[PDB]
Each structure stands twice: as C-alpha cells, then as structure tokens.
C-alpha cells in the first residue's frame, strides 16, 4: 500500500507493455534507465499514482527519448526527444561493453599494434571505458567508448596483471566504427600473474582461524512490513532501490515518546567519480562516473550468507529492468542485520555507589556493486543514540599500467614493470533534510580561539561561532579541519525544552576534494567534487549533482546550475550535498587484490532530544 | 622467563621488603608510583634483572625520593632526594582525595559560604582536583588540591546534577590546612535530578531488544603464553600494564613467512590532558593530566563478562602496589578477544569468472578507567592486513556548572540552570618505532596539485611529495587535512622486493589541537598538545611528553626540552609522539550520562610487505 514500496516484477512488465503498445519499444530500442519516481511534495497525498521514468536508446541512430509512464493508469504521461549534443548522452548499456572488443579485433590498426607486441588477439581483453569530453570535435553528438587493453594468458587468468600500455582506441558504438587508434610506443607487458587463488601465490592456507559464530536465538529486533518498511529501536524508514543510485533511504524518522519525528526525507549516494591523475595521453581522459555513466545498482552483487553478510540476515531482492523491459531480480541484493557495537554508556560513581554499563548496537543496510576491476560496498548504519552514518568500502583490483623505466611522479610500482596510476574515489551524498519537518536551515560551526586578556586572564577560554547560510550563492562551503568545522541542520520553528532549535550535526572526514586543475574537463563535469558541502533549495527535478545525462556532457550541469538560482534556504525545504572521497596512491599491499579501505560521514543529534535518547535501554 | 612479563604479587612484596630493609619505607612513607622498568637497549645482556622504579612520598613533609630497585638481586640501585619546588610534585595519592571534603567541613569560611546558600554541609560532596601552577606563591613546594562542591540530595543521588557555582577552596593536603576559600557570589543550585537509573526519568525499559549471541565453539584463535605473550594471525606481542600509563604494548611484530619482523618496540598513551575553556575564576585553573597527575592504571575497572566485554573473552588481572607496598590485583582489568570485522577483500571478475570474498577480523586489547565523573576506554586493535589502530572511548558524566542567566560563550546548557563548560580531551601516543629493526626515519607526505600546461595538457595530473625529517629541531609537525598529510616511518636499510624502503603510514584524524592561548599556564605545561607530531631520538629517560613529575610543575620538562638536543633522527632509533583529541561542546544528549564518543589514529603498512599479506586467508 505504501507509495515507497520497491518496484514489482509486475510493475516493470506493465511498463514494458505500455511502451510497446505506444510504439516506443521497437526492436531498435533499448532501455538505458528505468526507475520509479518519488511522490511529489504533498502532505496528505492519498491518490496512489505509481510513475516510472524511462530513458530509451535507439541503436539505429535515431534520437533517444525520455518517457514518463503511469503504471496505475496504464498511460504514457510524457515523451520528449533528446538532443544529446546539448544535454548529454544516455548511460552506457551493458551490451555495448562487448562491442568494443569485437570491433577492435577486426580493425587493421589495432591488429598491427598487437602484432608488433607479439600478442594474440584472442587473448587481448579490452576494458570499455567512458569517453568524457575533450578535444575531438568529431565526437560531439556520438556515443563514444574508449578501450584499453589487457592480456589474459588463459581463461581464468587475471588480465589486470598484464596491461598493454602505449595503446588506446576510440569507438563509435552506434555506427560501429573505430575512430582512432593511438599507439605511443611499445611498453613491455608485465609478465607476473596476479591470480590470488593460485596456491603458488597464496602459499598454504592458514589453519589458525577458529570460527566466530554470531546468532540471534530469538530472531532480529527489527521488523519488515510492506516489503521494505523497517522498524528498529525507535527508528522508522523505507529501503528503496534504484538502478542508478542503488540503495536509497526514505522517510528516516525517530519515535520520540509518542511522536514520530522526521529527520531525513531521502538519503542517497547521488554520484561517484573516479578521476585518474596520470598525464599520459593513454589515460589522461580516464574518469569513471560510476553512478551517472554506468548505473551502480544494475551491477549489484548477489550477497552470500556467511561470507558477504554474517549473522541473522534479512535479505531484500530488488527488481530492475533489463535493456528490453523484462524484469530482472537481483537475488539477495541487499543485506539487513543488526550488530553489537560495544559500549554505549558507562559510569562507575564513587559517591552514589552505582555502577552502570549499557551496550550499543547498530542497524546495517548494505549492498555491493562491481564495475569492471573495482568493487564497492555501500553501508548505511543507524545507531541507538540517534547517530546516522554512511560508509563506503573500496576493494577489488587496482587499475594498472606499465611502470616506466626511470620512474613516475603519477604512478605507483606494484610489481616488476607493473604500475598503478594515482586516482581518487569521490562520492556525493544527497540528503533531502526534514529535521522535525521541512522548515530547515544550515549553520557552519567553527571553533573560536580567544586571546589572553581582560575576561580571559588565564588564557584558557575558547568558544565557537555559527554562521547561518541564507542563500544558495553563499552555501558552497569548504572543510576546515584545523578549526573543527562542522555543519548543523536545524529547524528554527521546532525548539527543544531549553527553547533552542532542534538540530543534527554533520561530521565530515575532511579528506581532500578534487585535485585536478580547475580549468580541466573533469573539474567542469564533476564540479560538485571541488567543494565539501553544497546546500540547495529542494526542487523535484534537481536529483543528481552532475545532472540527468552525465555521459559525454560538456560540463556545468547539476549543482553549479542549481546554485546559480540563488534561492532562499533560511528555514525552507532544503537539500544538503556532501562531497567526500579517498585519494589513492596505490601501495604494494593493494596488489594483487586490494584489502578494504573506507571513507564516509556521520550525523549526530545536536539538541534534537531533550536528554539522552537511550536512557530506556535495558541492562541485559 | 620473559623480561616483559607482568609484575607479580611476589615482585611487589619483594620491592616492599627491599625498601623496608634499606630504611626507605618506614611508617611515614607512601608509595606514589611503582612500576617495572623496561630492559635497556641490548638484547639479552641482563639474562634476568627485573628493576622497579618507585616514587616515595613522606607524609611528615620531608623531601620525597625516587628509588630504583633490583628485585632479582635484592638491592637498591639508586635513591635520590627530590626538590619538588623545582622538578614537580609526586602524583596525587588516593588517600589525599579523601582529605579534602573532611577538612573543608570544619573550616568556618567554607561553612559560612554553604550557610549563605542554605546548604547542609552533610550533603555537600567536594570533587578534589589537581591544582596546576598559577599566581599563588604560597603553593610553591606544597601539595595542593582544589575543591569544587556538588550537592547530593540522598546517598544514591547523582551529585553532578547539583553544582554549587561561585565557590572554590584550596587545600594543603600535607599540613591539612585550608589555604584559601573564594566565594564570587551565590548561584542557584540546579534542582533537577540526573539519576539515569530512576524509572521516573528512564520511563519503562525497552522490551524490543533481542539477544545477539557471539560465541567461539572451538575457542579463540589467539594463544597466551608466559602470562602475557600473545600470538594471533601472524602477529606477536607482549601486553604490559603500568600503573601510570595503563596498558602498554611491547614487541609488536609480524611473522612474514619464516621471519619475525618487528614493527613497534613499545606503544602507549603516555599522557592525556583535559583542559577546560570556561574563563570563570571558579574553573579557569581546571586541567586534568589524567595519566601524569592521577595515574590512569590505578583506577582501572574490573570488566564484567557479557556487559563490558562480549564474546569469548580472555582476561588479564594486573597487579599494582597500594600506597604501603602491598600488592593489589585488578581482577579482570584487561579484556582480550577477537572480533569479526566485515569484508576483507572482494572481487567478482567478468573476464576470469572467479568470484572471491574474504572476511576480516581484529584482535582487541582494552581496559577502562574511571577518574571522578569521567570514564575512558582504551582500545588497541590489530587487523589481519597489518593495520594497527588505537581508539579512545569517552563516556561518563560531563562536568557541570551553573548556567548563567544571561547565557554564556564558554558553557553549554543541559537542563534548566545547569551548564557544562567547554573542554578538550587530548591524548599523546608514544610509539617507540622498530620498523624491521631500529634504523628508522620519518617522512612527511603531502599531496601535490599540478597546474595545467606542458606535460599536463588536460590538467588531470596530481602527485605527492615526501620530506625526510633529519633532525629533532625540524621534527615538530602540524596536520594539514587539506593536503592529505600523513607521515611515513620507514627503514632505509630494509628494502622490499621492488628495492623500496619498507614503511608504515600514520593516518591521523586531524582534530583540533590545544586551543588555549600560547601564553597560558596550560600551554606551557602541555606543550606536547600544541602540535600533532613530534619525533625524538630514543633515550632511556625520555618517557613522558610532560616529564616525570607533572603535578604542580611549571614548564621546563618534557618534549620541548628533549628536542632542543637536536639529535640526528635520519635512520636512527626514534620515537614518534602523536597528539590527538576531542573538542567537546556538550550537547543536551550528553545529559545525564554521556553516550560514547571516540577518537584515535591508525598505522597501515606502506610497502612493508611484498604483496598483500592476506592472500593466505581461507574462505570459511
Ligand atoms: Cu583506488
Ligand atoms: Cu568531554
Ligand atoms: Na528538505
Ligand atoms: Na625506536
């Protein structure tokens, strides 16, 4: 009954039929994106209308279309033709990946480059990568993929151990022609294998680990109703799934006594970009927008009990559309469980003689995606004390290159002749805030140092200051770890019992933001990644920090365009966009498969409650 | 057998007998500190010589002494008389804390102050706090405690809810004299109780939490031998305990194939300071050196199975001396256990068809201490992948004051009329490094941004730079989160298979350092806290960043005096001192008992290994 329920296989089947009957899904057509639309702002909206947004690609070269359909009523609501030279190309299709390697295998320049290196074309894998926008005027309005080559010595070999440096090709995947083959010179192909399941590399496996058994003899403490509505330890929320963003959290609220108090209306990772910092022309164009260009939800893993998710696990199995409109289930794609989290609060009081200890726990909602060589885990945590936390876990196989003789300022050496270019992994969290309702504002809080003198005779005082962000043009903020900078989202119309506005404080990790030169193509296309915090006024169509069509868009779409409207954000319906990322200088220990590294952020209550919200937790 | 074994009850009794026989421990003497000395540099040598360092107080006012004893040989090695007006007072004795409230209850100035506030002296608790060094000349060479008052309405009442503001007293605890009583005016005593076990405050306890059962059916994966030597998942170390520093880790090493490779010779929290930022004269002197002044190991809790430590727990019960030289056991004062830690590495490869997932684990060594209102947990973690991490957990009851009617720039309001002064909790980790042996160096690593132009035509390149710290005068460093600054400890004489020096990278949290004015008493006494990183050349007697005798000691000792020697630290036996801390602006949710907040640091291998060190972890 809930408007926020997961899409059904039946709903996707109905969408396919509606498109077919309307003549919009012929054999030349491919679905590049399909997702359910959130309800519009409407406090009391009772007329159920499930609407789906669809991007339709044409493999014969005709213009693509953006279509909105109503599954409840069985109608096409709107359909507009897209001019991709203006507004960007559609996301990359899974079936276009294979086309790159196939096309190059018959191209005479590619074959001659391989022949010079004595490489058998049947053993050469091509990574099909997004193109971006650079100097090639012939690419405007065409769907281009770029390919980099790796050698697979046998079918189970890790091709990432054998990059073929000095060689790159550009491919038009619609007209199926190879537009350029660039060969800058012969580099030795690294010869060591990177097969992390080969006993000759692992050695004998350890026999020293004894089992850790985590069970819940009475079952978990959370309930799941209506498919995806969660109730756990005073928290209430809906777990959504979108093929572009992955797991999305809706209607995060906390039951404070008798009232359900809203906190966040919608939480998602709305973009993630992986820019590479190697100036070689073989790779200097390389920037993955894993969310915007590839769609991270469509590559979600099926998660295995006891290996990926340990404990008493409740799974969700989201349904997405394939390229022809058929429903596809991602079995066990989302893990949900609770975890012990150590001590919550503890005090042994000499004067009262009371000894008090309580334990903490967290609710975990997670999924894992694989995009080529990289694998990313997305984890949302809810804690007993009101804290909300997100954590990204990065693993997989690092992207490789040759390691040049004489060294490099932009590439790490992992093995003899084997390099790994410097890169970043930068995420954008979109937090549609609803702190006790929709009238919210953001304050920037800095520590204030005070000088020794009158009123501070011993020179010990320090303080803090808060600055209200009142318009969008002043709501593009940078971190300052030295001054302990945080941001507070408050509701000026809802006060706690001390007559202070209720709030939540965002604690950032204060990692470096985008390092590229401000005049670069990537700085224009991923402008969100150049600043730590953005605040916008809510609008239905301002969904992604990079715009709707990221692939081969020339730049400026998304947050810079939104912010330019300079709207009032002082006690309004607002959206917080937080940039956070990992700067990765690969180390030898990252090879041949990388141990997890993590980055994230958290939000903590700041005068939201009238006292600690965990006084009613029992001892057990 | 091992020189690093925990002190035994017999050893402590033998120290007592040796001191008594030598005429050093008559009835007027008290042991203020007793601890075992680490072996001097030179592996073996002594065959067996257990030495103890003792600080001996005299309650008649005679000069105290520092004494070193050999328990093996039954001899006093050295005994020196201390001039405390020069080099500092001994740590506070537990029996001196009691003296303060008793003395004040008979002082006519204190009684008149309580009478002015209609308070019953029998219900007034006095927090006895370290005095520091300020403008009171009569305190030089005397042992002083300062007292702040709180009302306890009944024996089980939380007195922290009822501060008596405007009143402070200073007490000479040796001559038993109240030196000064300062009354700046009557403030209302906040009337609301803070009794977090009172059902009228907690409401009905939750019935929603289902059990989480963590068990190890085959027992734990680590072994304990010789009482305190641990072997776990290729790690090797000895767990020490010192009454001042608490848990100390010795001889941290990693078994890499057939070689035991040292990493850290000794790791400890060597000081921790809690400075308050309220400029009121009632509290502007308030600074706790919990390690140096109070001795945190002395106040270690007994940890209860299933509440404080959950899972298959192995306990250590360290032995300390009481004030008369009798052994006292802290039953179950150290918990050790291993914990599941999520995914270690994961990759699903399209080209090879191999799906690979491995799980991570960590070894946890922890203890908890209680000093008045505050409770601190100290956690050391060892991970499968070579990471070492420390985490401090702060909880307990926040220190309170009145909340002034006009508001305050330096105090938070927690409840009607009840304030909590701003403060910090700052730690100093002393890491006696031994990366593949004792020839080590520290490099500072910053990200380097590059300008678009020749050799970087697309403006995407970025790099890093490393700066070797060659002399102590240049090894006092600040964080810079914006440039991703880390520090690498390497061994220039031990190279990995790529012919690069092996190393470990220190990752800081980049939280603010000491905020007090640089001219203040606290800035001089806690100079270590003003900078994030210090490197010194190892010396036997350079143990604490604040020096040996912190109580009522002015500046002049500790890290600033050590680094003036300007010793060579480029490929030498070096010690890293890392400052990290929490800046606490108390929130309403911190009342009436504070949920845990955390801070820490971690060290990760950086080319220490020749490839990932966890390729031999099994699937399970
Ligand atoms: Cu990476
Ligand atoms: Cu605090
Ligand atoms: Na909002
Ligand atoms: Na050392």
Short mmCIF file of C-alpha atoms in Angstrom, two decimals, chain B residues 16 28 107 176 251 349 448 481 560 607:
data_model
loop_
_atom_site.label_atom_id
_atom_site.label_comp_id
_atom_site.label_asym_id
_atom_site.label_seq_id
_atom_site.Cartn_x
_atom_site.Cartn_y
_atom_site.Cartn_z
CA UNK B 16 58.40 -3.62 49.75
CA UNK B 28 55.58 7.89 57.39
CA UNK B 107 36.51 25.42 58.05
CA UNK B 176 45.96 19.72 56.44
CA UNK B 251 57.48 -6.04 20.87
CA UNK B 349 35.72 -10.70 -12.22
CA UNK B 448 50.86 17.92 -4.70
CA UNK B 481 44.00 17.72 6.18
CA UNK B 560 60.30 20.87 24.21
CA UNK B 607 55.43 -1.21 1.08
#
